[PDB]
Enzyme design. Sequence first.
Site, PDB file in Angstrom:
ATOM      1  N   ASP A  45     -12.302 -11.007  10.179  1.00  0.00           N
ATOM      2  CA  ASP A  45     -12.262  -9.881   9.242  1.00  0.00           C
ATOM      3  C   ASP A  45     -13.629  -9.265   9.047  1.00  0.00           C
ATOM      4  OD1 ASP A  45     -11.013  -8.200   7.147  1.00  0.00           O
ATOM      5  OD2 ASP A  45     -12.295  -9.362   5.757  1.00  0.00           O
ATOM      6  N   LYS A  62     -15.134  -5.515  10.124  1.00  0.00           N
ATOM      7  CA  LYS A  62     -15.881  -4.641   9.211  1.00  0.00           C
ATOM      8  C   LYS A  62     -17.261  -4.289   9.737  1.00  0.00           C
ATOM      9  CE  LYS A  62     -13.155  -6.071   5.266  1.00  0.00           C
ATOM     10  NZ  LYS A  62     -12.998  -7.267   4.404  1.00  0.00           N
ATOM     11  N   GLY A 120      -7.896  -3.638  -3.546  1.00  0.00           N
ATOM     12  CA  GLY A 120      -6.490  -4.035  -3.556  1.00  0.00           C
ATOM     13  C   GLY A 120      -5.608  -2.893  -3.054  1.00  0.00           C
ATOM     14  N   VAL A 139       0.831  -1.207   0.000  1.00  0.00           N
ATOM     15  CA  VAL A 139       0.000   0.000   0.000  1.00  0.00           C
ATOM     16  C   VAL A 139       0.877   1.274   0.000  1.00  0.00           C
ATOM     17  CG1 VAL A 139      -1.760   1.340   1.213  1.00  0.00           C
ATOM     18  CG2 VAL A 139      -1.933  -1.170   1.188  1.00  0.00           C
TER      19      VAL A 139
END
Lengths: 383, 394
Positions: free
Chosen positions: B184, B188, B285, B15
Site C-alpha cells: 500500500d 502511494k 474514510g 464509497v
Amino acid sequence: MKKLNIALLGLGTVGSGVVKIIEENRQQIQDTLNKDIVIKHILVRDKSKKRPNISQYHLTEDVNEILNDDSLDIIVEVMGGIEPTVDWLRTALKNKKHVITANKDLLAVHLKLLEDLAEENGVALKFEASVAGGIPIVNNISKFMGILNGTSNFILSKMTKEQTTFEEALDEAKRLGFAEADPTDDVEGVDAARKVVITSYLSFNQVIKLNDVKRRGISGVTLTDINVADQLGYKIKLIGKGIYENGKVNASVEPTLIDKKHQLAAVEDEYNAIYVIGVGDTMFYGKGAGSLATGSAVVSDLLNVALFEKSNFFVVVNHVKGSIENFENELKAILPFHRSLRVANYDNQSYAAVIVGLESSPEELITKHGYEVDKVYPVEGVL
Amino acid sequence: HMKKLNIALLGLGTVGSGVVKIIEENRQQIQDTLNKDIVIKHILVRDKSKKRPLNISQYHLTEDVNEILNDDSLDIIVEVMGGIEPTVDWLRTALKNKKHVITANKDLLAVHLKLLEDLAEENGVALKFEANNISKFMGILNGTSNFILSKMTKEQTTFEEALDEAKRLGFAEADPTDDVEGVDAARKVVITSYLSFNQVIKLNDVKRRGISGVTLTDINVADQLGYKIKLIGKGIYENGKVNASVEPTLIDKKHQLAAVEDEYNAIYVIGDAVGDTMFYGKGAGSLATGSAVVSDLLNVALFFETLPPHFELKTDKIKEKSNFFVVVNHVKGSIENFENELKAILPFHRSLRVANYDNQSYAAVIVGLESSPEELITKHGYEVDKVYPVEGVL
C-alpha cells in the site's frame, strides 16, 4: 490573441517575483491558454529607489493612473498597508476590476468588506495569505491551534535547547536576522494575533477584531518555566488559538504548555504550523510562504481569474510557606471540582501546578485565598 | 432554467453508497444554488439482485457497463469500482466518448493516471482522480503499519502481539499483507512520485521492505541512539531519475515525522529553495472520499463551456549522503573493538555511533556515506542481520 491587461501595486520581493514568473511563463500562458498577459503599470512608492533589475515595465508613482485606466482587467496588489491601500482596492472593485491581493496587513474586517464589494460588482477577489508554508487553502472546523510567528518560536527553541535566558535568546535572534531591532511585533504576539484573526475568518467565517484576540507575548517566559514544563511532560510554545463554540469565536495568543507528544510540540525554530480540529486532526507545517511561493500563488490565481471542553492550566504561585504536600492539599481544598492536579517545585517558596478540567483560570480564586499567583499559562494536548 | 447533469456510477461499495447519499442530501442546494440538477441515471454493480437499502433501489442498477458507456446523454462517469482490468479500459472508452471522468480507484498507478490524463486532454474533457521544485519527499503512508510500530514502541510488545492488537481494533484487516509488507505504501509512493516529480515509475521500481521483521530490540536500540522507527515511503528526484523506496527507517526523534503516531499519516516535502513542509492527517474514510468525489463533480459541473505547470526562475538571489543503521550478530570481542574495526574499514563518513543490541550483537548508526556499507561489512567477516536507512539530521 486575447490581451489580459494587468497592473501591479507594489514591487518588493513579492511583486518582483510575480513579474519574473509572468515573464518566464508568458509563452506557455500564450501558447496554451490563448491569453497574452500585459503588465501595463507597476505602482511603486519611489521610482528612484532600487530593485530586485532595471526593466521594461511602466513604473508610476501615481495610483490614479492605474485606477482610472479602463483597459485594465486585473489589479494585483502586493503593496501592504491598510491606508490607503484598502481604499485603492475598493475603487478597483467598484470599477469592475478583478483584484488579487497578497497584502499581509489585511485583517478580517478588510477581507469581508472586499469580498462583499467584489461579489456586489460581479468580479473576483482572491486573497493570498500564508501563515504556515504555504497558503490557506485550509469542515466544520471547531478549533485551531498554531505556531504562527517564526521569531517567537525561534527564541523559545533557543531558550529550551541551549538553556539561555529570554534576553540572551532574543539577542541571538537579532544577530541572526530573525528578530528586528524593535522585535515587539514578534515577541508581543501581535503578528501571531493578526494570523489568528485571518485564520478565524477563513475557518469559521466570522470576523473578529485584532484586539478581540487575548494576547500575551513571550518576554515573560523563563528558563524555569521551560524546565518545570519539561519535567511535567510539556514544551512551551507561543500558541495562536481559535475556538468556535455556540456562535462565538474565542481567540488568543499566549505562552502555552503543550504536551510533548502533540505534533505541535515538535515544531521548532522558525518553523510554523497550523493544527486543525473538527473527523481526525490535521496539520500543515512549514516556514510559511516565501516571496517566490507567494508570487507563484498570485500568478496561479491570475490564470484562474483569466479562465472564467474544559480548560487546563499551569499556575505558578510564590511566597508559599510550607511544604509542597501542604500546598497540594490546600489547592485540593480550594479549587472547584476538576479532573486532576499535579504540583512541582518551581523556585524557593514557589510551586507550580498543572490542573486539568476547570471552566476558567483559577488565578483570581487562588489570589482571593491569600496566595501570590505569579502567572497562569494554558495547557494543551492533554490526552 | 436548470440543466440536468446526467451521471453514472461504476460501483456501489461504501464509497459509491456515500457518493449517492451525499448527492441526495445536497441535491436541493446544488439545484437551488448552482442551477444544476444532478441525475444519477445508472449505477453499475456486480450483482443487481442482492438486497440493498430502500434509497438505492430507486436508481437504475445495471450489470452491463456498455449500457453506461453507450448512453450519450451522460455528462460524467464516476468510477469507484477499483481494479485495473477492465476498469481502466472502461474509462478510456468514456473519455474517448467525450465524457468527463472522476475516479476514486485505489488500484490506479502512475502509468494509468498519465495515460488517462492525456486521453482526457486529447478529448477535451476533465479527469479528476482522488485515488514547486520538489526534490525529495518522505512519508508515513500506511496507517496500519504505523499503528503497529507505535504500539510496539509505546507498549513494548512484539510485532506479532502488536499486529494482533491492530486486528482486534480494526486497524488491520485479517489478511494484513498489503499493509505490513509495505505494498500500500509503495503504491502511494508511485502516485506521490507522479504528482511531485511528474515522472511515471512502476510499482516494481519501488524498493520495498515491510515491517514484519522489525523487532522490539530494533525499537529500543534506535530509541537509545535517539531515533524512532517508522515505515517510510520515500522518493528522491536526482539527475532526471526518481529513486523510490518503502522500508523501516530510523528517524531522528527531533524530526517532525518522528512524532507521527498511531494511525496518522504524513507527507514531508523538501524543495530546492524553500523550507521543508509537512501535511499530517489520517487516511481518508469512505465518507471523505465520497465527499471529494462530489466536490470534483461540482467543479467539473463548471466546465460548462486547461493544463500547465508554472516554471520558475530564481534571480531571487553534491548528491546528498546516506545514513545507515547496521545490525551485526555473532560478533566476538567488545563493542570498542567493533567500533574500531568499523572506523578502520568504512569509507569516509561524518559520524559513527555503536550500541549493544543483543548477546554478541551490536548496532551502528553511520552518518554520511555515499552508499550502504552492508557488502563491505559482510566482506570483513561480520554477519549482517540487517540494515535500515536513517533519516533526519543536523
